[PDB]
Design a protein around this ligand. Structure first.
Ligand code: FAD
Ligand code: CL
Ligand code: CL
Ligand code: CL
Ligand code: NA
Length: 296
């Protein structure tokens, strides 16, 4: 089992990776280019008296982490679960892997579902965590909302509870890879790009209303838009939330041992300067955690 995985390759995850790798801990970082990493002027990050682009600042962060031995991977994470037993099981598009300690640095970027009355059906049909709520919809007709590999994997997990699963990409282009498409086809899980306008049903969800005015029956709607997010991981790990953010103490510890959180996903002042300090503090906490708990 690896001692440490960092999920996130923005300022928080990279600042943390620099510190952990310098302390001699084999460091594996998962993440892709953050949203800030484009042609945007950064002018308020300490130490840069001349304008630097987000793309270039992040690129220097990456070279900095690699300089001290951090390995950076572009793999998207699909799920995080407590391992059986001990440490954490990390689901990626490529397969599985495992880690003794996790630093969550996945930011707050989120594809939104775009359903006018979705809030009316929270707890009554609309769910998020499959391991959490899947059993309640066993044998039932369940729709997964989302366009990506995350949606595809959530749909496949749902098969543990019901054979009656399909995916709606909510008007978006699907970005499901051919390997996942194969798996969906083999399982009889259909994918279409219809757009759900609203939900219907009187004690609970029973009908999806498409922007057409056409309808489909479903008693379960699992939201899985875009990429798996900090909230999605929180649901499966049992990490306590603070509104839409992860709860973290001043040392970036969550309520789950071995799980730390840093950057935008702990939501205060959503800035590079802030993320870089949280990443550093998370690293310090992880390093001492690993020394007591994870031999390597
Ligand atoms: C255009 C733009 C301009 C900005 N301008 C400024 C500015 O001038 N000054 C300033 O201080 N701040 C600015 N910000 C805000 C600043 O970028 C953020 O506060 C900062 O990047 C937070 O860093 P982070 O590491 O917490 O998250 P992010 O930068 O969002 O990075 C999150 C990381 O998580 C990874 N990730 C997420 N989900 C997964 C997954 N499922 N699997 C694998 N990896 C995943 C992402 O790929 C990314 O690598 C700007 C942001 C944007 C977008
Ligand atoms: Cl700056
Ligand atoms: Cl143990
Ligand atoms: Cl209702
Ligand atoms: Na924060």
């Amino acid at each position: 089992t690896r001692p440490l995985v960092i999920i996130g390759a923005g300022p928080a995850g990279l600042s943390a990776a620099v510190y952990t790798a310098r302390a001699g801990i084999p460091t594996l970082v998962f993440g892709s280019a953050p949203k800030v990493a484009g042609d945007y002027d950064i002018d308020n990050y300490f130490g840069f008296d001349e304008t630097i682009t987000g793309r270039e600042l992040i690129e220097r962060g990456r070279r900095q982490a690699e300089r001290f031995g951090a390995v950076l991977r572009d793999d998207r994470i699909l799920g995080l679960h407590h391992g059986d037993d001990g440490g954490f099981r990390i689901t990626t598009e490529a397969g599985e892997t495992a880690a003794c300690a996790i630093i969550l640095a996945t930011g707050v970027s989120r594809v939104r579902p775009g359903i006018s009355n979705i809030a009316d059906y929270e707890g009554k049909g609309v769910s998020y965590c499959v391991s959490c709520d899947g059993f309640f919809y066993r044998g039932l007709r369940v729709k997964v909302l989302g366009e990506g590999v995350f949606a595809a994997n959530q749909a496949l997990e749902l098969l543990h509870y019901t054979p009656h699963v399909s995916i709606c990409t909510q008007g978006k282009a699907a970005s499901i890879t051919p390997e996942f498409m194969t798996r969906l086809d083999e399982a009889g899980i259909a994918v279409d790009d219809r757009k759900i306008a609203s939900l219907e049903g009187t004690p609970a969800l029973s009908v999806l209303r498409y922007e057409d005015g056409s309808t489909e029956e479903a008693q379960g709607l699992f939201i899985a838009m875009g990429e798996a997010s900090s909230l999605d991981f929180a649901y499966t790990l049992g990490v306590e939330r603070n509104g839409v953010f992860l709860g973290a103490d001043s040392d970036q510890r969550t309520n789950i041992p071995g799980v730390f959180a840093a950057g935008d996903c702990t939501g205060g002042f959503l800035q590079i300067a802030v993320a870089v300090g949280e990443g550093a503090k998370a690293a310090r906490a992880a390093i001492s955690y690993i020394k007591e708990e994870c031999p390597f």
